[PDB]
Amino acid sequence: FIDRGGFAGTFYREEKVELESDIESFGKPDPLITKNLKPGANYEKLVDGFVPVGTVVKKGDI
Amino acid sequence: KIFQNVEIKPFLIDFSNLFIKNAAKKLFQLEEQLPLVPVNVVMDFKGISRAAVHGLSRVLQDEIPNYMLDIKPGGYKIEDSTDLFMTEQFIRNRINFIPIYAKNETLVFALRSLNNSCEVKTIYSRDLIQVAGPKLKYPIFNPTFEIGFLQPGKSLIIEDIYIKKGIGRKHAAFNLAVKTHFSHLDIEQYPTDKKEYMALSGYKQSSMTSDPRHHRLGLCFPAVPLPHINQAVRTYLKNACRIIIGRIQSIQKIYENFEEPQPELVLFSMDEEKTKAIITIKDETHTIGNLLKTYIYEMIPDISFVGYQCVPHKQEMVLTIIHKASQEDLITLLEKSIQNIIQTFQILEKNVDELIA
Amino acid sequence: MLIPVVCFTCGFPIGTYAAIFDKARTEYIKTKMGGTLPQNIPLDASLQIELKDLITALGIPMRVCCRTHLITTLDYRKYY
Amino acid sequence: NNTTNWNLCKACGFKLLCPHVDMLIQLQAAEASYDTMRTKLMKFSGIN
Ligand SMILES: [Zn+2]
Ligand SMILES: [Zn+2]
Numbered sequence: 295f296i297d298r299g300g301f302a303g304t305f306y307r308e309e310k311v312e313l314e315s316d317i318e319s320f321g322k323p324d325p326l327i328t329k330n331l332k333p334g335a336n337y338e339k340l341v342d343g344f345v346p347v348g349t350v351v352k353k354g355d356i
Numbered sequence: 357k358i359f360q361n362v363e364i365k366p367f368l369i370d371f372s373n374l375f376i377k378n379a380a381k382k383l384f385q386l387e388e389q390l391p392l393v394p395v396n397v398v399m400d401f402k403g404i405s406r407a408a409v410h411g412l413s414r415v416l417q418d419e420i421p422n423y424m425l426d427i428k429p430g431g432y433k434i435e436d437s438t439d440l441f442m443t444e445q446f447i448r449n450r451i452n453f454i455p456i457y458a459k460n461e462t463l464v465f466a467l468r469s470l471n472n473s474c475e476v477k478t479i480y481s482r483d484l485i486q487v488a489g490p491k492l493k494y495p496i497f498n499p500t501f502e503i504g505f506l507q508p509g510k511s512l513i514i515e516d517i518y519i520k521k522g523i524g525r526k527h528a529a530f531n532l533a534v535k536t537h538f539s540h541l542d543i544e545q546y547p548t549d550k551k552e553y554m555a556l557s558g559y560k561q562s563s564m565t566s567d568p569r570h571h572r573l574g575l576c577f578p579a580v581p582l583p584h585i586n587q588a589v590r591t592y593l594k595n596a597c598r599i600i601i602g603r604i605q606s607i608q609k610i611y612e613n614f615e616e617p618q619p620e621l622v623l624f625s626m627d628e629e630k631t632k633a634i635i636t637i638k639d640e641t642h643t644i645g646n647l648l649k650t651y652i653y654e655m656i657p658d659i660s661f662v663g664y665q666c667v668p669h670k671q672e673m674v675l676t677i678i679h680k681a682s683q684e685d686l687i688t689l690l691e692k693s694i695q696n697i698i699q700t701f702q703i704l705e706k707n708v709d710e711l712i713a
Numbered sequence: 714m715l716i717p718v719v720c721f722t723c724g725f726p727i728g729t730y731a732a733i734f735d736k737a738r739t740e741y742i743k744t745k746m747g748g749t750l751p752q753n754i755p756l757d758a759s760l761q762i763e764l765k766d767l768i769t770a771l772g773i774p775m776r777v778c779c780r781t782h783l784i785t786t787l788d789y790r791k792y793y
Numbered sequence: 794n795n796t797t798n799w800n801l802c803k804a805c806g807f808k809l810l811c812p813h814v815d816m817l818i819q820l821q822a823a824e825a826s827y828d829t830m831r832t833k834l835m836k837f838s839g840i841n
Contacts, residue, residue, distance in 0.1 A: 297528035298721050299449050325841075329832060348434045369730070373770035379737035393772075394726060441789070446714065453718040455726045476790055480732070498729040502715050505790050534723045536774070576774070578719075578726045 320344065332356070358404050358700070359707035364589055366582070367394040384482075384500055391495045392457060392581055396536055397589050398574035406540070407650035408700060409571045411643040415596045416533040416575055418524030419643065423458045425451050425465070425497075428516035436513035442479075442504045450504065451517065452529040454481060455579035456497045457588065458519050463496070464488035465517040471506040479504045479512060487515075494581060525641065532592070537574030540566075590712040597705045601698055603644050608694050610635065611687050623683050630660060631686050633677045640673035642666050648675055651693040714789035722778035730771045734783060737767060796836070813837040 296302070313319070320343030323331065331337070336355040339345050345355070368389055371377050380386040401409050432444040466487045471477045482499030486492060506512055524531035544560040546553040559566065580588045610621050624632040637644070645664030652662050661678040679686050716735070718728035745762050746754065754760065768780055794800040794812060802809040813834055820830050 295528075295721050298453060298719060298724065299717065300721050302449070304443065304445060367772040367774065369772045370770035373767065375737040375740055375767060376733060376770045378740070379733045383732060383736060390729065396774075441714070450715075450718055453724070454728070455719070478732070478790075498726075500729045500732060501718060502728060502732050505715070528724065531724050534725050576725070578724070 357402070357707060358703050359399060359401055359711065361400040362397065362711045364395060364397050364585060364712070366580070366585060367396065367576075384480075386500070389582060390498050390500065392455070392498050392579040394576055394578050395580045395585055395589060396574060396576045398537060398572065400541070401571045401573065403569055404571070404700065404704075405650050405654070406568055406571055407646045408697075408704075409573055410538075411600060411647050412596055412704070413533075413535070413538070413573055413575065414641065414643045415599050416592065417535065418528075418531050419641065420532050420592070420596055420599055421521055421523060422530040422532050423456055423461070423519050423521055424529045425454055425456055425517055426520040427451065427514060428518060431514055431516035433513040433515060436511055439504075439506050439510040439512050441507065442512055447504055447512070447514065450501075452527075454497050454501055456519070457579045457581060458496050460489070461519050461521060462489040463492070463519055467503065467512065467514040467517065469504075469506055469512045471508060471510050474508045476508065477506050478502060479506060484517065497579065533575040533577055535574075536576045537572060539572050540568035540570065541572055542568050542570035586712050590708060593708045593712075594705060597701045597708070600643070600647075601701050603640075604647070604694055604697050604701075607635065607637070607644070607648070608691070608698075610637075611690050611694070614683070614687050625683070626678070628680070629682075630678060630680050631683050633675075633679075633683075633686055633690070635675040635677075636672055637675075638672045640666065642673075645673045645675055647697055648693070651697050652677060652690065655689055655693045655696065716786045716788070717782060720776070720779045720782050722782070723776065725774070725776065725779045727773065727779055727783050730773060731783065734768065734771055735788070738764060741767060 322337060322340040322343060325331065334354050339349060339351065339355055345351055369376065369380070371380075371387070427444075427448045432447070464487055465484045467479070467484055469477070469479045469483055479502075480499065481497055481501035481503055483503070484497075504512065522530045540559070543566055545558045546556065546560060548554050548556070548558045557563075577589065577592065610618060614621055614623065620636055622634040622636075624634075626632055635648075642664070645666050649662050649664045653659060656679060659677070659679050661676065663676050664673060665676070666673045677686065677690070679689070681689070716728060716731035718731075719725060720727050741764070742754070742762060745760060747757075747760075749757050764784060768783060769775075773779055773783065796812060799808040800810045800812065800815075801807070816834060816837075817830070820833060825833070
């Protein structure tokens with residue numbers, strides 16, 4: 295009954311991030327310039343500052 | 357002759373009903389039977405334990421290999437699928453549970469639906485175009501399924517729809533047979549219409565005491581071609597037999613290696629000349645354990661103990677056998693019981709081949 | 714959002730007779746509706762709409778679960 | 794033994810002292826704050 299779709303659906307969450315006017319920006323950081331990057335992170339999935347739609351993001355991914 | 361008196365009956369659409377006739381004829385231009393129909397098969401077994409019949413039923417339900425239609429990762433084309441309601445999860449759940457009767461694992465389909473109209477357009481299963489593999493001389497699924505629906509001006513493009521193999525226990529989309537009947541023909545029954553007996557099961561013997569050996573089992577298969585029903589059902593039955601034998605033969609490779617230290621077999625020598633054998637097998641169900649317990653109990657009427665405990669949260673079957681013989685004699689009796697199981701299912705194979713013409 | 718392809722309980726192929734069962738049912742209701750607004754059908758207090766023979770003619774067996782899910786499943790196209 | 798491998802003891806032959814330990818000791822004796830110590834020991838960062 296579970297596998298056939300009984301009480302099955304999709305659950306949604308949202309991420310709303312804001313900027314500081316002309317200080318901050320959206321983009322992929324680089325290791326050799328930016329400071330105190332989060333340990334055990336994954337910055338390679340970013341495309342122009344945002345992860346592309348349709349990819350699977352897991353724990354530790356930026 | 358363990359298995360006799362089998363009868364097979366398909367599930368067909370009654371076109372004498374005007375409503376169904378008109379609806380089918382104006383929806384799918386359908387005036388005769390669908391290529392694939394469900395088939396109800398009723399089987400009578402005599403001189404066989406209910407453990408074996410129930411194990412055969414369980415294997416035919418969700419322990420036999422079976423084929424479904426699945427979408428490869430990246431098949432759902434986000435670049436082209438503009439529909440906001442037909443999500444990948446919903447559509448792939450719809451596709452996985454379409455009953456198919458496939459010939460090989462090479463067929464690859466595709467679903468390309470474009471909605472150029474101003475009304476919601478329903479995507480049926482007849483819109484699945486075979487794009488890879490040999491061309492089909494007969495459909496493998498019915499064209500009357502409702503895969504989805506598109507809002508006006510939307511689209512749904514899915515590629516790499518392949519055939520995936522698995523057992524029904526792991527995922528329900530591989531389930532094969534749906535139960536329709538199970539009864540014991542050698543036990544009398546009360547008339548349960550009376551208010552005196554409606555609180556009881558009906559049988560005149562308690563399950564704590566009864567040992568029926570004459571059963572009727574009726575199972576329904578969801579998709580079988582019309583002109584080869586007897587060819588399909590028979591195959592299914594035969595398939596089940598091999599599976600059980602195969603699994604039993606696995607245990608037959610354990611007892612043969614009782615001299616060497618084997619993780620799945622543990623032998624103790626208890627007090628009062630008593631010996632103990634523990635067989636722990638991972639990813640086994642109540643089928644093999646129940647068969648083993650029943651046949652060991654039949655082989656050794658005066659056994660001290662036997663149990664087949666299958667634990668849900670441990671995903672394993674532990675068969676404990678305590679008997680007042682030596683280790684060698686116990687292993688000999690276990691091998692004899694396994695051989696009895698093998699010959700019983702071989703006789704089932706032969707009867708299946710003999711009955712269904 | 715539609716009638717399930719297979720019965721949620723046992724897995725009988727309900728979906729392959731789903732669409733037809735929808736459309737045909739409508740005419741049957743049109744036969745039994747009677748001087749009443751559509752949205753007031755479940756409040757008529759005089760209707761005897763029985764779908765036993767329709768499902769039987771579809772070839773679906775007399776299973777409780779299968780007919781329950783065939784009859785009672787809502788359709789998203791009909792509300793949106 | 795600037796980077797990428799252990800310092801080895803000439804007297805015996807086994808490992809002696811990892812370079813980041815040397816840099817950490819130098820910073821600790823050189824009135825280095827934690828932030829000025831966390832950022833400088835970033836060329837020794839582990840698996841990326
Ligand atoms: Zn059902
Ligand atoms: Zn040294």
